[PDB]
């Protein structure tokens, strides 16, 4: 990889995009050497990993280099010069006063990821590099910007469009279960994945389901158990080495969107070309055999309306200050920033509350921001029941959700700011009730 040969890539202001083919050692071979070079040069270095899995892998790889691995609170005077942490950890640390450090070189792995923390993190680092405050290395097979759904790969890939079950199925689709070898099947949602997994197990196949909720614990089981099928959301687009020879890819994704002041989860969108390329990129890792990519439909690069962009600006605005040059999203993504930069910045005490809601109460950035903006006492939960009547939340039995406050009054779950992701897709209304009731 020529651009990172020598030391030119380490000069302040240099931004390097490393777009190696999947399976070519980006994370497990190149990145560690990069870090050792920085450590040898005595340069303060930041290494960002997409997930805990990768973070502990990176840890391992840096076996001679003195690093401080951050597995979000706290600060030490121990004095290692390389810090390694997840994308979200970087953002969350910068929400607090004690967490706003500076590094001369920053290396971000899986830098395409469209979780808002990742978007915010690469935006902040890009903005710092544009101000000549650090060097920046973005490592990803699908750099944000132009892209091809069928990029080059180390091994041959047969790509074929076929009808794919929209959940369970009862007859046909025999090619699914006749396949000898292991498959990764991408689904748009946890809900769809549960349906797909149910049929596969009924047909005698072994299945592991991966999503945002299960990935850090169950991804490790894939190597150990070698399931017939990995049924996965887009969470596997971010470094997961699933060790399959076929991908099944409906090319859809859930579509969280703020509509009429609420974040809705209705329907799906066709995936972006980058996303499609990452899904397809689970196979073709080596030469030898010919892998398969079975898909359905076309891509849709226009993801501008998704709530992720707003959430990324919410996060970026609160890890930057009003003073100094204005931050942006990473290059071509700036088009998708929904307001003028700084719009969502909170004062220091509201930001502390904002951070708590995300890190201790599992709130989305969108919901944490609205609560932090509009509430003054962190113990006041009345906003969870003082919303409009169309924000009433159905419980598991389809009835209203009733709960008691500590004083004994009975309330109906009906938030002022309604984020459907808090009651679906890996989050359970029962845990929100724990918050609303003041437990």
CSV table of C-alpha atoms in Angstrom, one decimal:
chain,number,residue,atom,x,y,z
A,1,UNK,CA,0.0,0.0,0.0
A,2,UNK,CA,2.1,2.8,-1.4
A,3,UNK,CA,0.6,5.9,0.1
A,4,UNK,CA,1.6,4.8,3.6
A,5,UNK,CA,5.1,3.7,2.7
A,6,UNK,CA,7.7,5.9,4.4
A,7,UNK,CA,6.7,8.7,6.7
A,8,UNK,CA,4.9,11.2,4.5
A,9,UNK,CA,1.5,10.1,5.6
A,10,UNK,CA,2.3,11.3,9.2
A,11,UNK,CA,2.7,15.0,8.4
A,12,UNK,CA,0.1,17.3,9.9
A,13,UNK,CA,-2.6,18.0,7.3
A,14,UNK,CA,-2.1,14.8,5.3
A,15,UNK,CA,-5.3,12.8,4.8
A,16,UNK,CA,-4.8,9.3,3.5
A,17,UNK,CA,-7.6,6.9,2.4
A,18,UNK,CA,-6.5,3.3,2.4
A,19,UNK,CA,-9.0,1.3,0.3
A,20,UNK,CA,-7.5,-2.3,0.2
A,21,UNK,CA,-9.5,-5.3,-1.0
A,22,UNK,CA,-11.4,-7.1,1.8
A,23,UNK,CA,-9.3,-9.8,3.3
A,24,UNK,CA,-5.9,-8.2,2.5
A,25,UNK,CA,-4.8,-7.6,6.1
A,26,UNK,CA,-6.0,-4.0,6.6
A,27,UNK,CA,-6.9,-4.5,10.3
A,28,UNK,CA,-4.7,-7.5,11.3
A,29,UNK,CA,-1.5,-6.7,9.5
A,30,UNK,CA,-1.3,-3.1,8.1
A,31,UNK,CA,-2.8,-1.3,11.1
A,32,UNK,CA,-0.4,-2.8,13.7
A,33,UNK,CA,2.6,-1.9,11.6
A,34,UNK,CA,1.3,1.7,11.3
A,35,UNK,CA,0.9,2.0,15.0
A,36,UNK,CA,4.4,0.6,15.7
A,37,UNK,CA,5.9,3.1,13.3
A,38,UNK,CA,4.1,5.9,15.1
A,39,UNK,CA,5.2,4.6,18.5
A,40,UNK,CA,8.8,4.4,17.3
A,41,UNK,CA,8.6,7.9,16.1
A,42,UNK,CA,7.2,9.0,19.4
A,43,UNK,CA,4.1,10.5,17.8
A,44,UNK,CA,0.9,10.8,19.9
A,45,UNK,CA,-1.5,8.5,18.1
A,46,UNK,CA,-5.2,7.7,18.1
A,47,UNK,CA,-6.5,4.5,16.8
A,48,UNK,CA,-10.2,4.1,16.3
A,49,UNK,CA,-11.9,0.7,16.0
A,50,UNK,CA,-15.5,0.1,15.0
A,51,UNK,CA,-16.3,-2.5,17.6
A,52,UNK,CA,-15.1,-4.0,20.9
A,53,UNK,CA,-14.4,-7.2,19.1
A,54,UNK,CA,-12.0,-5.4,16.8
A,55,UNK,CA,-10.6,-3.3,19.7
A,56,UNK,CA,-9.6,-6.4,21.6
A,57,UNK,CA,-8.2,-7.8,18.3
A,58,UNK,CA,-6.2,-4.6,17.8
A,59,UNK,CA,-5.0,-4.8,21.4
A,60,UNK,CA,-3.6,-8.2,20.8
A,61,UNK,CA,-2.0,-7.1,17.5
A,62,UNK,CA,-0.2,-4.3,19.4
A,63,UNK,CA,1.8,-6.8,21.5
A,64,UNK,CA,5.1,-4.8,21.7
A,65,UNK,CA,3.8,-1.3,21.5
A,66,UNK,CA,2.8,0.6,24.7
A,67,UNK,CA,-0.8,1.6,24.2
A,68,UNK,CA,-3.6,2.6,26.4
A,69,UNK,CA,-6.6,0.6,25.3
A,70,UNK,CA,-9.8,2.2,26.3
A,71,UNK,CA,-12.3,-0.6,26.8
A,72,UNK,CA,-15.1,6.2,28.3
A,73,UNK,CA,-14.9,7.7,31.8
A,74,UNK,CA,-11.7,8.6,33.5
A,75,UNK,CA,-8.2,9.8,32.7
A,76,UNK,CA,-4.7,8.6,33.7
A,77,UNK,CA,-1.3,10.2,34.2
A,78,UNK,CA,0.3,6.9,33.2
A,79,UNK,CA,1.7,8.4,30.0
A,80,UNK,CA,1.4,6.0,27.1
A,81,UNK,CA,1.3,7.8,23.8
A,82,UNK,CA,-0.9,5.6,21.6
A,83,UNK,CA,-4.6,5.5,22.6
A,84,UNK,CA,-6.9,2.8,21.1
A,85,UNK,CA,-10.7,3.0,21.5
A,86,UNK,CA,-14.0,2.5,19.6
A,87,UNK,CA,-15.5,5.1,17.4
A,88,UNK,CA,-18.3,5.7,19.9
A,89,UNK,CA,-15.8,5.9,22.8
A,90,UNK,CA,-14.0,8.7,21.1
A,91,UNK,CA,-17.2,10.7,20.7
A,92,UNK,CA,-18.4,10.0,24.2
A,93,UNK,CA,-15.1,11.0,25.8
A,94,UNK,CA,-15.2,14.3,24.0
A,95,UNK,CA,-18.6,15.1,25.4
A,96,UNK,CA,-17.0,15.6,28.9
A,97,UNK,CA,-14.5,18.2,29.9
A,98,UNK,CA,-11.8,15.7,31.0
A,99,UNK,CA,-12.0,13.8,27.7
A,100,UNK,CA,-10.9,16.4,25.0
A,101,UNK,CA,-7.4,15.3,24.2
A,102,UNK,CA,-5.3,16.0,21.1
A,103,UNK,CA,-3.3,13.5,19.0
A,104,UNK,CA,-0.9,14.2,16.1
A,105,UNK,CA,-1.8,11.2,14.0
A,106,UNK,CA,-5.3,9.6,13.9
A,107,UNK,CA,-6.1,6.2,12.2
A,108,UNK,CA,-9.7,5.2,11.8
A,109,UNK,CA,-10.6,1.6,10.8
A,110,UNK,CA,-13.8,0.8,9.0
A,111,UNK,CA,-14.2,4.5,8.3
A,112,UNK,CA,-17.2,4.1,6.1
A,113,UNK,CA,-19.6,3.1,8.9
A,114,UNK,CA,-22.8,5.2,9.0
A,115,UNK,CA,-23.5,4.9,12.7
A,116,UNK,CA,-23.8,8.6,13.8
A,117,UNK,CA,-20.9,8.2,16.2
A,118,UNK,CA,-18.7,7.0,13.3
A,119,UNK,CA,-19.9,9.8,11.0
A,120,UNK,CA,-19.2,12.4,13.7
A,121,UNK,CA,-15.8,10.9,14.6
A,122,UNK,CA,-14.5,11.0,11.0
A,123,UNK,CA,-16.0,14.5,10.5
A,124,UNK,CA,-14.2,15.8,13.6
A,125,UNK,CA,-10.9,14.2,12.6
A,126,UNK,CA,-11.2,15.3,9.0
A,127,UNK,CA,-11.9,18.9,10.2
A,128,UNK,CA,-8.8,18.7,12.5
A,129,UNK,CA,-6.6,17.5,9.6
A,130,UNK,CA,-7.9,20.3,7.4
A,131,UNK,CA,-6.8,22.7,10.0
A,132,UNK,CA,-3.3,21.1,9.9
A,133,UNK,CA,-3.7,19.9,13.5
A,134,UNK,CA,-3.1,16.2,12.8
A,135,UNK,CA,-2.5,13.6,10.1
A,136,UNK,CA,-5.5,11.3,9.3
A,137,UNK,CA,-5.7,7.8,7.9
A,138,UNK,CA,-9.1,6.5,6.9
A,139,UNK,CA,-9.1,2.7,6.3
A,140,UNK,CA,-12.1,1.2,4.4
A,141,UNK,CA,-12.9,-0.8,1.3
A,142,UNK,CA,-15.8,1.7,0.5
A,143,UNK,CA,-14.6,5.3,1.1
A,144,UNK,CA,-17.5,7.7,1.4
A,145,UNK,CA,-18.1,9.2,-2.1
A,146,UNK,CA,-18.4,7.5,-5.4
A,147,UNK,CA,-18.5,3.8,-5.4
A,148,UNK,CA,-19.3,0.6,-7.3
A,149,UNK,CA,-21.7,-2.2,-6.1
A,150,UNK,CA,-19.4,-4.8,-7.7
A,151,UNK,CA,-15.8,-3.7,-6.8
A,152,UNK,CA,-12.7,-5.7,-7.3
A,153,UNK,CA,-12.0,-8.6,-5.0
A,154,UNK,CA,-9.1,-11.0,-4.3
A,155,UNK,CA,-11.2,-13.9,-5.4
A,156,UNK,CA,-13.8,-14.5,-8.1
A,157,UNK,CA,-17.5,-13.8,-7.2
A,158,UNK,CA,-20.5,-15.0,-9.1
A,159,UNK,CA,-23.1,-12.2,-8.6
A,160,UNK,CA,-26.7,-13.3,-9.5
A,161,UNK,CA,-30.0,-11.6,-8.9
A,162,UNK,CA,-32.7,-13.9,-7.5
A,163,UNK,CA,-35.9,-13.5,-5.6
A,164,UNK,CA,-35.1,-13.7,-1.8
A,165,UNK,CA,-37.6,-14.6,0.9
A,166,UNK,CA,-39.0,-11.5,2.7
A,167,UNK,CA,-38.9,-13.3,6.0
A,168,UNK,CA,-40.3,-16.8,6.4
A,169,UNK,CA,-41.1,-19.0,3.4
A,170,UNK,CA,-43.1,-22.2,2.9
A,171,UNK,CA,-42.2,-23.5,-0.6
A,172,UNK,CA,-39.6,-22.8,-3.3
A,173,UNK,CA,-36.3,-21.0,-2.9
A,174,UNK,CA,-34.7,-24.5,-2.8
A,175,UNK,CA,-31.3,-23.0,-3.8
A,176,UNK,CA,-31.2,-21.6,-0.3
A,177,UNK,CA,-31.1,-24.9,1.6
A,178,UNK,CA,-29.5,-27.0,-1.1
A,179,UNK,CA,-26.3,-25.0,-0.9
A,180,UNK,CA,-23.2,-26.9,0.4
A,181,UNK,CA,-21.1,-24.4,2.4
A,182,UNK,CA,-21.8,-21.5,4.7
A,183,UNK,CA,-23.9,-18.5,4.0
A,184,UNK,CA,-24.3,-14.9,5.3
A,185,UNK,CA,-27.8,-13.6,4.7
A,186,UNK,CA,-28.2,-9.8,5.2
A,187,UNK,CA,-31.6,-8.7,6.5
A,188,UNK,CA,-33.0,-5.1,6.9
A,189,UNK,CA,-34.0,-5.5,10.5
A,190,UNK,CA,-33.8,-7.6,13.6
A,191,UNK,CA,-37.5,-8.3,13.1
A,192,UNK,CA,-36.9,-9.7,9.6
A,193,UNK,CA,-33.9,-11.6,10.7
A,194,UNK,CA,-35.9,-13.4,13.4
A,195,UNK,CA,-38.4,-14.5,10.7
A,196,UNK,CA,-35.6,-15.7,8.3
A,197,UNK,CA,-33.8,-17.5,11.2
A,198,UNK,CA,-37.0,-19.3,12.2
A,199,UNK,CA,-37.5,-20.9,8.7
A,200,UNK,CA,-33.8,-21.8,8.5
A,201,UNK,CA,-33.9,-23.7,11.8
A,202,UNK,CA,-37.1,-25.4,10.8
A,203,UNK,CA,-35.3,-26.7,7.8
A,204,UNK,CA,-32.5,-28.2,10.0
A,205,UNK,CA,-29.9,-25.5,9.5
A,206,UNK,CA,-27.8,-24.0,12.2
A,207,UNK,CA,-28.1,-20.2,12.5
A,208,UNK,CA,-26.4,-17.4,14.4
A,209,UNK,CA,-28.2,-14.0,14.3
A,210,UNK,CA,-26.0,-10.9,14.4
A,211,UNK,CA,-27.3,-7.4,15.0
A,212,UNK,CA,-26.4,-4.3,17.0
A,213,UNK,CA,-27.7,-5.9,20.2
A,214,UNK,CA,-25.9,-9.3,19.8
A,215,UNK,CA,-22.8,-8.7,17.8
A,216,UNK,CA,-20.2,-8.1,20.5
A,217,UNK,CA,-21.2,-11.3,22.2
A,218,UNK,CA,-22.2,-13.6,19.4
A,219,UNK,CA,-19.8,-12.7,16.6
A,220,UNK,CA,-17.1,-14.7,18.4
A,221,UNK,CA,-19.3,-17.8,18.2
A,222,UNK,CA,-19.2,-17.8,14.3
A,223,UNK,CA,-15.6,-19.0,14.2
A,224,UNK,CA,-16.3,-21.5,17.0
A,225,UNK,CA,-19.5,-23.1,15.7
A,226,UNK,CA,-19.3,-22.4,12.0
A,227,UNK,CA,-23.1,-22.2,11.5
A,228,UNK,CA,-24.8,-23.0,8.3
A,229,UNK,CA,-26.2,-19.5,8.2
A,230,UNK,CA,-25.3,-16.2,9.7
A,231,UNK,CA,-28.4,-14.0,9.6
A,232,UNK,CA,-27.1,-10.5,10.1
A,233,UNK,CA,-28.2,-6.9,9.9
A,234,UNK,CA,-25.9,-4.3,8.4
A,235,UNK,CA,-23.8,-4.6,11.6
A,236,UNK,CA,-21.6,-7.1,9.7
A,237,UNK,CA,-20.6,-4.4,7.2
A,238,UNK,CA,-17.9,-3.2,9.6
A,239,UNK,CA,-15.1,-5.8,9.7
A,240,UNK,CA,-17.0,-9.0,10.5
A,241,UNK,CA,-15.0,-11.9,9.0
A,242,UNK,CA,-17.9,-14.3,8.7
A,243,UNK,CA,-15.9,-17.0,6.8
A,244,UNK,CA,-18.7,-17.8,4.4
A,245,UNK,CA,-18.7,-18.7,0.7
A,246,UNK,CA,-22.1,-17.2,-0.2
A,247,UNK,CA,-23.9,-14.0,0.6
A,248,UNK,CA,-27.7,-13.6,0.3
A,249,UNK,CA,-28.5,-9.9,0.2
A,250,UNK,CA,-32.0,-8.5,-0.2
A,251,UNK,CA,-30.3,-5.1,-0.4
A,252,UNK,CA,-32.7,-3.5,2.0
A,253,UNK,CA,-32.3,-1.7,5.3
A,254,UNK,CA,-34.5,-0.2,7.9
A,255,UNK,CA,-35.2,3.5,7.4
A,256,UNK,CA,-35.2,5.5,10.6
A,257,UNK,CA,-36.5,9.0,9.7
A,258,UNK,CA,-37.7,12.0,11.6
A,259,UNK,CA,-41.2,12.6,10.3
A,260,UNK,CA,-43.5,15.2,11.9
A,261,UNK,CA,-41.1,15.4,14.9
A,262,UNK,CA,-41.0,11.7,15.6
A,263,UNK,CA,-38.5,9.1,14.6
A,264,UNK,CA,-40.4,6.4,12.7
A,265,UNK,CA,-39.4,2.9,11.7
A,266,UNK,CA,-41.8,2.1,8.9
A,267,UNK,CA,-40.7,0.2,5.9
A,268,UNK,CA,-37.3,-0.1,4.3
A,269,UNK,CA,-35.1,1.5,1.8
A,270,UNK,CA,-32.8,0.0,-0.8
A,271,UNK,CA,-29.2,0.0,0.5
A,272,UNK,CA,-26.6,2.3,-0.7
A,273,UNK,CA,-24.0,1.2,-3.2
A,274,UNK,CA,-21.3,1.3,-0.4
A,275,UNK,CA,-23.5,-0.9,1.8
A,276,UNK,CA,-24.1,-3.3,-1.0
A,277,UNK,CA,-20.4,-3.5,-1.7
A,278,UNK,CA,-19.7,-4.2,1.9
A,279,UNK,CA,-22.3,-7.0,2.0
A,280,UNK,CA,-20.8,-8.5,-1.1
A,281,UNK,CA,-17.4,-8.0,0.4
A,282,UNK,CA,-17.9,-10.8,3.0
A,283,UNK,CA,-16.9,-13.1,0.2
A,284,UNK,CA,-14.3,-13.2,-2.5
A,285,UNK,CA,-11.6,-12.8,0.1
A,286,UNK,CA,-9.1,-15.1,-1.4
A,287,UNK,CA,-8.3,-16.7,-4.7
A,288,UNK,CA,-9.0,-20.3,-5.2
A,289,UNK,CA,-12.7,-21.1,-5.3
A,290,UNK,CA,-15.5,-18.9,-6.7
A,291,UNK,CA,-17.8,-17.4,-4.1
A,292,UNK,CA,-21.5,-16.4,-4.6
A,293,UNK,CA,-23.3,-13.1,-4.1
A,294,UNK,CA,-27.1,-13.5,-4.5
A,295,UNK,CA,-29.0,-10.3,-4.4
A,296,UNK,CA,-32.3,-8.7,-5.1
A,297,UNK,CA,-32.9,-5.3,-6.5
A,298,UNK,CA,-30.8,-2.2,-7.0
A,299,UNK,CA,-29.1,0.3,-4.7
A,300,UNK,CA,-30.2,3.8,-3.7
A,301,UNK,CA,-27.4,6.2,-2.8
A,302,UNK,CA,-29.8,8.9,-1.7
A,303,UNK,CA,-29.9,8.3,2.1
A,304,UNK,CA,-30.1,12.0,2.9
A,305,UNK,CA,-33.4,11.8,4.7
A,306,UNK,CA,-32.2,9.3,7.3
A,307,UNK,CA,-32.0,10.4,10.8
A,308,UNK,CA,-28.4,9.3,11.1
A,309,UNK,CA,-27.2,12.6,9.6
A,310,UNK,CA,-29.0,14.7,12.1
A,311,UNK,CA,-27.7,12.4,14.9
A,312,UNK,CA,-24.2,12.7,13.6
A,313,UNK,CA,-24.5,16.5,13.6
A,314,UNK,CA,-25.9,16.4,17.1
A,315,UNK,CA,-22.9,14.5,18.2
A,316,UNK,CA,-20.3,16.5,16.2
A,317,UNK,CA,-21.7,19.8,17.5
A,318,UNK,CA,-21.2,18.7,21.1
A,319,UNK,CA,-17.6,17.4,20.6
A,320,UNK,CA,-16.6,20.8,19.0
A,321,UNK,CA,-16.6,24.3,20.3
A,322,UNK,CA,-18.0,27.6,19.0
A,323,UNK,CA,-14.5,29.0,18.8
A,324,UNK,CA,-12.0,28.2,16.1
A,325,UNK,CA,-12.8,27.0,12.5
A,326,UNK,CA,-16.2,25.4,12.0
A,327,UNK,CA,-16.3,21.6,11.8
A,328,UNK,CA,-17.8,19.6,8.9
A,329,UNK,CA,-18.6,16.0,8.1
A,330,UNK,CA,-16.0,14.1,6.1
A,331,UNK,CA,-15.6,15.6,2.6
A,332,UNK,CA,-18.4,14.4,0.5
A,333,UNK,CA,-20.7,13.7,3.4
A,334,UNK,CA,-21.0,17.4,4.2
A,335,UNK,CA,-23.8,17.7,1.7
A,336,UNK,CA,-25.9,15.7,4.2
A,337,UNK,CA,-25.4,17.8,7.3
A,338,UNK,CA,-29.0,19.0,7.9
A,339,UNK,CA,-28.4,22.4,9.7
A,340,UNK,CA,-25.6,24.9,10.0
A,341,UNK,CA,-22.7,23.5,12.0
A,342,UNK,CA,-23.0,24.2,15.7
A,343,UNK,CA,-26.9,24.3,15.6
A,344,UNK,CA,-27.2,21.4,18.1
A,345,UNK,CA,-24.4,22.5,20.5
A,346,UNK,CA,-25.5,22.3,24.2
A,347,UNK,CA,-24.1,24.1,27.1
A,348,UNK,CA,-21.8,22.1,29.4
A,349,UNK,CA,-24.4,20.9,31.9
A,350,UNK,CA,-27.0,19.8,29.3
A,351,UNK,CA,-24.2,18.0,27.5
A,352,UNK,CA,-23.4,16.0,30.6
A,353,UNK,CA,-27.0,15.0,30.9
A,354,UNK,CA,-27.0,14.2,27.1
A,355,UNK,CA,-24.0,11.9,27.6
A,356,UNK,CA,-25.6,10.1,30.6
A,357,UNK,CA,-28.8,9.4,28.7
A,358,UNK,CA,-26.8,7.7,25.9
A,359,UNK,CA,-24.2,5.9,28.0
A,360,UNK,CA,-26.3,4.9,31.1
A,361,UNK,CA,-29.9,4.9,29.8
A,362,UNK,CA,-29.3,3.5,26.2
A,363,UNK,CA,-31.0,6.5,24.6
A,364,UNK,CA,-30.5,7.3,20.9
A,365,UNK,CA,-28.6,10.5,20.2
A,366,UNK,CA,-31.8,12.0,18.8
A,367,UNK,CA,-33.8,11.3,21.9
A,368,UNK,CA,-31.0,12.2,24.3
A,369,UNK,CA,-30.6,15.5,22.6
A,370,UNK,CA,-34.3,16.5,22.8
A,371,UNK,CA,-34.6,15.5,26.4
A,372,UNK,CA,-31.3,17.4,27.3
A,373,UNK,CA,-32.3,20.5,25.4
A,374,UNK,CA,-35.8,20.8,27.0
A,375,UNK,CA,-35.4,19.5,30.6
A,376,UNK,CA,-33.7,21.2,33.5
A,377,UNK,CA,-33.8,18.7,36.3
A,378,UNK,CA,-32.5,15.3,35.4
A,379,UNK,CA,-34.9,13.6,37.8
A,380,UNK,CA,-38.0,14.9,36.2
A,381,UNK,CA,-39.6,12.2,34.1
A,382,UNK,CA,-42.9,13.9,33.3
A,383,UNK,CA,-41.9,14.3,29.6
A,384,UNK,CA,-42.4,10.5,29.3
A,385,UNK,CA,-46.2,10.9,29.8
A,386,UNK,CA,-46.9,14.5,28.8
A,387,UNK,CA,-46.7,14.0,25.0
A,388,UNK,CA,-49.6,14.1,22.6
A,389,UNK,CA,-52.1,11.3,22.5
A,390,UNK,CA,-50.8,9.9,19.2
A,391,UNK,CA,-47.5,9.2,21.0
A,392,UNK,CA,-49.0,6.6,23.4
A,393,UNK,CA,-46.9,3.4,23.4
A,394,UNK,CA,-48.5,0.0,23.0
A,395,UNK,CA,-47.3,-2.7,25.3
A,396,UNK,CA,-46.7,-6.4,24.5
A,397,UNK,CA,-50.4,-7.2,25.0
A,398,UNK,CA,-51.4,-4.3,22.7
A,399,UNK,CA,-52.8,-2.3,25.6
A,400,UNK,CA,-51.6,1.0,26.9
A,401,UNK,CA,-48.4,1.0,29.0
A,402,UNK,CA,-49.4,2.0,32.5
A,403,UNK,CA,-46.8,2.6,35.2
A,404,UNK,CA,-46.6,4.1,38.7
A,405,UNK,CA,-44.3,7.1,39.6
A,406,UNK,CA,-42.5,6.8,43.0
A,407,UNK,CA,-45.3,8.9,44.6
A,408,UNK,CA,-47.9,6.4,43.5
A,409,UNK,CA,-49.6,8.2,40.6
A,410,UNK,CA,-50.4,6.1,37.6
A,411,UNK,CA,-49.3,7.3,34.2
A,412,UNK,CA,-49.6,6.1,30.5
A,413,UNK,CA,-46.4,5.9,28.6
A,414,UNK,CA,-46.7,8.7,26.0
A,415,UNK,CA,-43.5,10.7,25.5
A,416,UNK,CA,-43.2,14.2,24.2
A,417,UNK,CA,-40.3,13.1,21.9
A,418,UNK,CA,-41.2,9.7,20.4
A,419,UNK,CA,-38.3,7.6,19.0
A,420,UNK,CA,-39.7,4.3,17.8
A,421,UNK,CA,-36.1,2.8,18.1
A,422,UNK,CA,-36.6,2.9,21.9
A,423,UNK,CA,-39.4,0.2,21.7
A,424,UNK,CA,-38.3,-2.0,18.9
A,425,UNK,CA,-35.2,-3.4,17.1
A,426,UNK,CA,-33.3,-4.6,20.1
A,427,UNK,CA,-34.7,-2.2,22.8
A,428,UNK,CA,-37.5,-3.2,25.0
A,429,UNK,CA,-40.3,-0.9,26.3
A,430,UNK,CA,-39.8,-2.6,29.7
A,431,UNK,CA,-36.4,-1.0,30.1
A,432,UNK,CA,-37.9,2.4,29.1
A,433,UNK,CA,-40.5,2.0,31.8
A,434,UNK,CA,-37.7,1.6,34.3
A,435,UNK,CA,-36.4,5.0,33.3
A,436,UNK,CA,-39.9,6.6,33.2
A,437,UNK,CA,-40.8,5.3,36.6
A,438,UNK,CA,-37.7,6.7,38.2
A,439,UNK,CA,-36.2,3.3,39.2
